[PDB]
Each structure stands twice: as C-alpha cells, then as structure tokens.
Amino acid sequence: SSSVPSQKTYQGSYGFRLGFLHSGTAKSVTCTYSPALNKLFCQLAKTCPVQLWVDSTPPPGTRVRAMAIYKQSQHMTEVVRRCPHHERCSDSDGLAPPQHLIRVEGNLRAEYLDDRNTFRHSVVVPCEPPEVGSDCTTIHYNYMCYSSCMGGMNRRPILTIITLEDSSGNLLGRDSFEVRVCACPGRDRRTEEENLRK
Numbered sequence: 001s002s003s004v005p006s007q008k009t010y011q012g013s014y015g016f017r018l019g020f021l022h023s024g025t026a027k028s029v030t031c032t033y034s035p036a037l038n039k040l041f042c043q044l045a046k047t048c049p050v051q052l053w054v055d056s057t058p059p060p061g062t063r064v065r066a067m068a069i070y071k072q073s074q075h076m077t078e079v080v081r082r083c084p085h086h087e088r089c090s091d092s093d094g095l096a097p098p099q100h101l102i103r104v105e106g107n108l109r110a111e112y113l114d115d116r117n118t119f120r121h122s123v124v125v126p127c128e129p130p131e132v133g134s135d136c137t138t139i140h141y142n143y144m145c146y147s148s149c150m151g152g153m154n155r156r157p158i159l160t161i162i163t164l165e166d167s168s169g170n171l172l173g174r175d176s177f178e179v180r181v182c183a184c185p186g187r188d189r190r191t192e193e194e195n196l197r198k
C-alpha cells in the first residue's frame, strides 16, 4: 500500500558510499558486517556503526537519511515498522517515535519523519566532518526489533537505504545493505557465509 523508494546505488557528485568496521564473528560480537552478503548482522538495539565516505566534501547543510524496506518483491510495498509488542514497550527516547525501527544513537539533532504520503519512517541527521583523528564520519544506528518479531518483520529480510541529501531533501547519493537483527550475529554471519560458499 505504499510507493517503493529506490534502492539503486548512486555515488553522485561527491562519490558517496558506505563503509563498515571489521568486527569479526565471535559469539560475543554485537554487530558484524558481511561484505560477501552485503549484510549487517546485529543484536537488538545495540550500536551499529556505519561509515560515510566521500571523494569530496559536500556543502554545509547536507544530511544523511536511513530508511528500511522489505527486500522481497511481495513485501516491498509494506511499511517496515516495529512489531505490536515493541511499539508498546515504552522504550522511546523522546525523539524516536515508538513505531520506528531505526534510531540514531547519541545525536540530539536526529529528526524522525513519518512521510505524509507514503507513511514510511526514516531518521535523518546533519552531516558533520570527521572527528579529529579519523578519515570518515560515522553514524551509530540502532535497530529496535528482531527480524523474527511476530506481527512486525516476521522473519522477512529488510534492506536499509542510506541517502545523502541536500538541505531541501534532494538526493545527492544512495547506498544500501541488508540487515538481520538477531540474538547471535557472529554465529549467523558464519552460517550464512558458509551457506553461500556451498
């Protein structure tokens, strides 16, 4: 029942693309990224660092938006939202609406949008230059339901679409990755990578 945002990779004029830390697959890992699967595996509500890389610095007022969509064709028109349990668990920080799957952690300038026409959720933050001893800016995301949550994602895979935007919201660049929110990301990444090898 909602229009489907593009997931097509688009570096644009600034050469925009994502990067991910190399956190490994130990049983204790809270978030780990598989380049072979283009897939982030993370625990519920834990910090997911996502790097922003550009070839040239975009203008002041540039922002970065995150939105989830279902990966599969039969589900892509459905808004990705938190499940009936988690939307009612009183865990909002006062900024993120309790229905939103994706939050930004530790940024008081995060804004949360309920799109008036598509009803899709997204979270957008201003782009700032890298910290003093760093080559890239990093955003910390949290995912607020498990992939398995009944009445929400319900075991359906999702993509996160990251869009670099100007101050009006016009597209400057786009990238994306699949997400699985699960209890043991390290084990699940190993299993899915071993499966891909077979």
Ligand SMILES: Nc1n[nH]c(C(F)(F)F)c1Br
Binding pocket: 052, 053, 054, 057, 058, 062, 127, 128, 129, 130, 136, 137
């Ligand atoms: N000075 C900068 N380096 N990288 C960025 C990014 F966030 F837009 F990617 C800026 Br703004």
Ligand SMILES: [Zn+2]
Binding pocket: 082, 083, 084, 085, 086, 087, 144, 145, 146, 149, 150, 152
């Ligand atoms: Zn849930």
